[PDB]
Write a protein that binds this ligand. Structure first.
Ligand SMILES: [Mg+2]
Ligand SMILES: [Mg+2]
Ligand SMILES: [Mg+2]
Ligand SMILES: [Mg+2]
Ligand SMILES: [Mg+2]
Ligand SMILES: [Mg+2]
Ligand SMILES: [Mg+2]
Ligand SMILES: [Mg+2]
Ligand SMILES: [Mg+2]
Ligand SMILES: [Mg+2]
Ligand SMILES: [Mg+2]
Ligand SMILES: [Mg+2]
Ligand SMILES: [Mg+2]
Ligand SMILES: [Mg+2]
Ligand SMILES: [Mg+2]
Ligand SMILES: [Mg+2]
Ligand SMILES: [Mg+2]
Ligand SMILES: [Mg+2]
Ligand SMILES: [Mg+2]
Ligand SMILES: [Mg+2]
Ligand SMILES: [Mg+2]
Ligand SMILES: [Mg+2]
Ligand SMILES: [Mg+2]
Ligand SMILES: [Mg+2]
Ligand SMILES: [Mg+2]
Ligand SMILES: [Mg+2]
Ligand SMILES: [Mg+2]
Ligand SMILES: [Mg+2]
Ligand SMILES: [Mg+2]
Ligand SMILES: [Mg+2]
Ligand SMILES: [Mg+2]
Ligand SMILES: [Mg+2]
Ligand SMILES: [Mg+2]
Ligand SMILES: [Mg+2]
Ligand SMILES: [Mg+2]
Ligand SMILES: [Mg+2]
Ligand SMILES: [Mg+2]
Ligand SMILES: [Mg+2]
Ligand SMILES: [Mg+2]
Ligand SMILES: [Mg+2]
Ligand SMILES: [Mg+2]
Ligand SMILES: [Mg+2]
Ligand SMILES: [Mg+2]
Ligand SMILES: [Mg+2]
Ligand SMILES: [Zn+2]
Lengths: 49, 49, 91, 63, 164
RNA sequence: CAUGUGCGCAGCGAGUCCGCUCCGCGGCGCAGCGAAGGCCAUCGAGCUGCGCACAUGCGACCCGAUAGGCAGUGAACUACGCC
RNA sequence: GCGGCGAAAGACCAAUCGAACUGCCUGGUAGCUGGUUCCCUCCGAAAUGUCCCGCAGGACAGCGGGCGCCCCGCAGGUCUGCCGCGUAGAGCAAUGGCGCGGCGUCCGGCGCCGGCGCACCCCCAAACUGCGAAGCGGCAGGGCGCGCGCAGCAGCGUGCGCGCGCACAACUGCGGGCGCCUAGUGGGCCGCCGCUGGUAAGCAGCGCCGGCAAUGAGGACACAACCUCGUGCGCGGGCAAGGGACCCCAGCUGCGCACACAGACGAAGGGCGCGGGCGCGCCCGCCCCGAAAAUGGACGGUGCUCAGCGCAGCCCCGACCCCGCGCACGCACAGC
RNA sequence: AAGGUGAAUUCUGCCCAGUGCCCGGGUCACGCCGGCGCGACCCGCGCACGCACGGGUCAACGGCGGGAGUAACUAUGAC
RNA sequence: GGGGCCGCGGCCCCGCUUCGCGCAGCAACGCCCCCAGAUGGGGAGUUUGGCUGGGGCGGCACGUCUGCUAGACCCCAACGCAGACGUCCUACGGUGGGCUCAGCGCGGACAGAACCCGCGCGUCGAGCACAAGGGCAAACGCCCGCCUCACGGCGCCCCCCCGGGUGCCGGCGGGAAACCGGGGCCUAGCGAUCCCUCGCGCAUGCACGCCGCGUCGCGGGGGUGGCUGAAAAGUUACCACAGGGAUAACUGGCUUGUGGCGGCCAAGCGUCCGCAGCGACGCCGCUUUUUGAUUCUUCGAUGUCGGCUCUUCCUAGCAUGGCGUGGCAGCGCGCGCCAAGUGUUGGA
């Protein structure tokens, strides 16, 4: 039989595009305490958060 | 040809949809390592053990 | 059937009529290193599947009875084919 | 498919085209003879014109 | 198959079976003769063949006969009085792997070298060689003569003496 | 075409066969039997070629599948996704 | 591309999709279908047996042809003789059924009724037989007689060697035996007689013989099989089957019978219809009723009422048959 | 991410035997080890996943029975 | 799961980092590699018999045996008839001796329909494992004694085998012996090559010895019942191809069971009264408008129901024309005859 759609969606051309991602959201690795200002609260495509 | 559930003359599964976790990919369709099935009706404590 | 344990019959080695102790012949297990056991074993190794037939339509519920005859004089061994039976006792 | 099972039609006509040939004549054979009789007949043929007592006087014990 | 016949052993089941035809066979023969003539003209005084030993054939089917061997052993060349490296410079073939097995094959080949070197005339260089006017030997040097075996005879009164 | 068998023809015949090659003690035959150890005749015309018929392998009297495989090419129609 | 893609239809993926297209393997394999190319001459089948994942196929055997060799007597036959069979018929005598009476120092019930017994009898039998055909089958019709040797067999013979002597065996026909190689065939069908299943069948399945297949020609109106009868190319004769009003070759003489758009599909049952016969009833011929299908129409047609149904006498026509002749071809060649 | 059902409303009963899934604690392969041997060997033992056994689970696959009597006529059968 | 994957420490456990890794972590495990189990229609190949009044389902004249079919040698077909076999038996085998069975009769305490015994008769009606047939009475049955011929080696025949028959040389048993016995009274009760296994071999290790580490020969056995012997589940209405009128699903043809129609007989019904009209029980036909049966034609295709439309034909006559009959007063109705000209509707 043909390949089921579950295996067929595992191929990497079905993943979401990288251009929708605003950036990697990592906690900064800091030696000393870092003081930041929240500059903007933005929306990412797909992400409700 | 499309699916393990892909059936005939009446829309039914036909075999247990709880599949093993050691199943081949292409067989892992439906409830893939189901400890139980059916409506829960209970606390987390009564169902997990 | 019921067979006696003892039977005076002709001994090929004695060339006499001597008493023979009677028991049933049962087939031994197949040895490890017969030429057909070896040839089948070398054929089975690898990715070859089942290279020989396995009979699946059996029909016979009996085997032919074979008696071992052991000479009390010679300690000679010889055999006799009797009829097919389901059951046999000695004595 | 279902067809004819058997006939003997044209078999007698076939069997008489080259005729019913007889048993073909041969040399007389010792096949089927009594063994004690055949053994003794050959002993009589072996010592045919010379007797056995004269034969074993020549060739020693013939057995 | 139908009738009484020997069972067929015809092996043309493979479609990869080739056929080697022999249409070059008369042409290769004239090429082979021409190269042999040109070899003889390249080595004008020197014989076209090496001197090869007489060896006995191997198995029990064939040890009744002798054939022409590959080369002489170095111990045969030494007993004949030659260094085997010198023996190759004159037209003698040398076999390093044949074993000196017995005195009869040894002494026959030692004599075979001695007869050969006695039959040689040397020349100074190539120009002296080509102008010699010496007829060169064509064919195998001292081949073993094939003969029907002569039947030896003894007297009948001597039969019990020789073979009791 | 190869290899057989049968028949016919041909040469020689206890021998026979030029055509691998620069020169077959290579094959078969002159005698078989047995798994073998062993036995060995009371004994027998073959060898080679040519031709036909026939058997078999080969595309195999000619033409014919649906299939199977190996290696490739296409998303200009159309399906979906993205820009 | 055993991949895609699919709001899912196995949809779509270049007019191609339940696995695209191109090239190759590849002239894939086919027990299946189709086709398979000159002439004459000589001969000429099988559709059966056994086995086979065998049933649309094979192999072996049988049958055909070709090639041989060998002189051994040969036969789809009759006669004579001896054995074999268990069918048709016949039989209830045993086995197994069928049925009533009759009989009774039998039993039961109330002289009767019922059982049982016996004897007669009845209807019977593919899986019954005290009998048993027609019909078939086997075998024999040639070597014998005497004598001598041999044997380990035997116990007083039997075989086998050898010699001498005798000798050609019912009828009729006639050359025969054996070997080698190879084809085709292995769906058969029909008739006769004998059957099996089936309500039956242009059904199905057998036996024997003959046919068709592969057999023309004549006659059947036409018509694989029926009848005659075989068949080179002609000529002459004579015929067969079948016919002899006209189609259409060939008919006349006499004796009957029948009237129904009959002859020209038919049953049980009928007919003061006619003709004969026997004792009003039967019998025999012909006729009538029973007797109704769908295109208009079929004794073959025309037609026929002596062209129908019967008979007798003489005759005639009619095949490639038979005979004779001639030629061709084949043969082992005064011929066939 | 994998499935089923297919808005709502009203509901979604019973069944874990079978099969499946899940969970938990006798049998089994090679190697190892051991015996034996001059060696090949041969002979044995130990064992995991699994099976087995025990348990869970049906909005997992699915499944969801008979026979008798019995009331103020009968009929029906609450029983 | 085991092994390989070259690290240190300490008590399989715990640290460690310097290997490795998806790398601030994990950590000498594991990745990885090598063997070995387990699972595995996710996938790959392939298979899924035949006979057959089409095929399927069913059943096996698919191997063997008996009686019949079978038509008087033998042979002889059908999804023909009636059955059977695949086992069973140390006796139910071998043999010797004796005996006579089934059944009937008449006697005999308890004792009865049926206990046991006796006498008389008793052609086989009994028994002989079983299916059937054949066979058999001082036996081929029953009983008892002694036995194990239910044996080895060579043959031969009937002959695919299976099975059986018959010899020879040994070895025996029973019997005084002749004799009999090579399993079962006879006819069924069984199985190739290769492989395995056992017994036996005056076999063998192709450079030579040795080691059962093997190989052979001979004879058994382990088995193919689809029984001359593949190792094998389905589905396809998405289907493909080669074909088949060798073969089904229409028509046609043969047949006519069934369907339809018509006769004959006359028990009986009909107030009386067989026949005004019916008509049982039976019997004889016809038809091809039903359905079967069959498989002859067609499968390189004859478009498969019904209707609509439109034409024609048959008569076994519904109406219309003429009649005969009545259990016909009239009216009507029944029955029958001749005649196929003209008709035979609209609707749920
Ligand atoms: Mg699937
Ligand atoms: Mg489904
Ligand atoms: Mg649904
Ligand atoms: Mg499944
Ligand atoms: Mg492996
Ligand atoms: Mg060829
Ligand atoms: Mg092709
Ligand atoms: Mg394939
Ligand atoms: Mg590809
Ligand atoms: Mg579909
Ligand atoms: Mg398209
Ligand atoms: Mg071709
Ligand atoms: Mg002819
Ligand atoms: Mg046939
Ligand atoms: Mg055909
Ligand atoms: Mg043949
Ligand atoms: Mg009879
Ligand atoms: Mg009779
Ligand atoms: Mg027919
Ligand atoms: Mg004719
Ligand atoms: Mg004709
Ligand atoms: Mg004609
Ligand atoms: Mg005339
Ligand atoms: Mg005229
Ligand atoms: Mg003529
Ligand atoms: Mg829906
Ligand atoms: Mg469960
Ligand atoms: Mg469980
Ligand atoms: Mg799988
Ligand atoms: Mg598959
Ligand atoms: Mg079939
Ligand atoms: Mg008979
Ligand atoms: Mg018995
Ligand atoms: Mg007995
Ligand atoms: Mg009896
Ligand atoms: Mg028997
Ligand atoms: Mg016997
Ligand atoms: Mg078969
Ligand atoms: Mg078979
Ligand atoms: Mg469907
Ligand atoms: Mg047909
Ligand atoms: Mg009818
Ligand atoms: Mg058409
Ligand atoms: Mg048409
Ligand atoms: Zn002994």
């Amino acid at each position: 039989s043909k390949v089921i759609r579950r295996l067929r969606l595992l191929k990497p051309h079905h993943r979401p595009k990288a251009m929708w991602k605003v950036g990697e959201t990592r906690i900064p690795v800091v030696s000393e305490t870092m003081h930041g200002v929240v500059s903007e609260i933005v929306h990412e495509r797909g992400k409700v958060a | 040809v499309d699916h393990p559930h892909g059936g005939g003359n009446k829309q039914h599964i036909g075999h247990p949809s709880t599949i093993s976790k050691h199943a081949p990919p292409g067989q892992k369709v439906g409830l893939v390592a189901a400890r139980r099935t059916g409506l829960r009706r209970g606390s987390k404590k009564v169902l997990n053990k | 059937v019921n067979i006696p344990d003892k039977r005076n019959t002709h001994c090929k080695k004695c060339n006499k009529h001597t008493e023979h102790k009677v028991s049933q012949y049962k087939k031994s297990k197949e040895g490890r290193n017969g030429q057909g056991t070896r040839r089948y074993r070398r054929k089975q190794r690898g990715y070859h599947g089942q290279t020989k037939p396995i009979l699946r339509r059996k029909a016979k519920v009996t085997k032919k009875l074979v008696i071992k005859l052991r000479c009390s004089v010679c300690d000679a061994k010889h055999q006799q084919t009797m009829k097919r039976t389901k059951h046999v006792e000695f004595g | 498919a279902k067809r004819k099972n058997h006939t003997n039609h044209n078999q007698n006509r076939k069997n008489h085209r080259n005729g019913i040939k007889k048993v073909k004549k041969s040399a007389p054979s010792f096949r089927g003879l009594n063994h004690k009789y055949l053994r003794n007949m050959l002993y009589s043929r072996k010592y045919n014109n010379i007797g056995r007592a004269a034969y074993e006087a020549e060739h020693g014990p013939q057995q | 198959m139908k009738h009484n016949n020997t069972l067929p052993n015809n092996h043309f089941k493979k479609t990869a079976i080739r056929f080697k035809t022999w249409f070059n066979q008369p042409a290769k023969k004239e090429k082979r003769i021409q190269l042999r003539k040109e070899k003889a003209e390249k080595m004008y005084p020197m014989p076209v063949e090496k001197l090869r030993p007489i060896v006995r054939c191997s198995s029990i089917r064939y040890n009744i006969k002798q054939r022409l061997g590959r080369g002489f052993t170095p111990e045969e060349c030494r007993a004949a009085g030659l260094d085997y490296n010198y023996a190759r410079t004159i037209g003698i073939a040398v076999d390093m792997r044949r074993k000196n097995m017995n005195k009869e094959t040894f002494d026959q080949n030692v004599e075979r070298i001695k007869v050969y070197t006695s039959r040689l005339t040397f020349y100074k260089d190539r120009k002296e060689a080509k102008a010699s006017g010496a007829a060169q030997h064509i064919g195998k040097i001292m081949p073993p003569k094939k003969t029907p075996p002569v039947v030896q005879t003894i007297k009948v009164e001597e039969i019990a003496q020789k073979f009791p």
